[PDB]
Design a protein around this ligand. Structure first.
Ligand SMILES: [Fe+2]
Length: 52
């Protein structure tokens, strides 16, 4: 359930919510995001998220 924050824009990935519009169901951990997933607010890579 660990949240991660985008260091570009401040969006928080919340595993309890997932990211349905990008094919990520509620409950999906950050580490299990698809390899091509990017921040939905700004487009930044996962490599620029940090644990929040
Ligand atoms: Fe972002």
């Amino acid at each position: 359930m660990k949240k991660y924050v985008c260091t570009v824009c401040g969006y928080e990935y919340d595993p309890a919510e997932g990211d349905p519009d990008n094919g990520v169901k509620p409950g999906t951990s950050f580490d299990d995001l698809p390899a091509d997933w990017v921040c939905p607010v700004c487009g930044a890579p996962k490599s620029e998220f940090e644990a929040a």
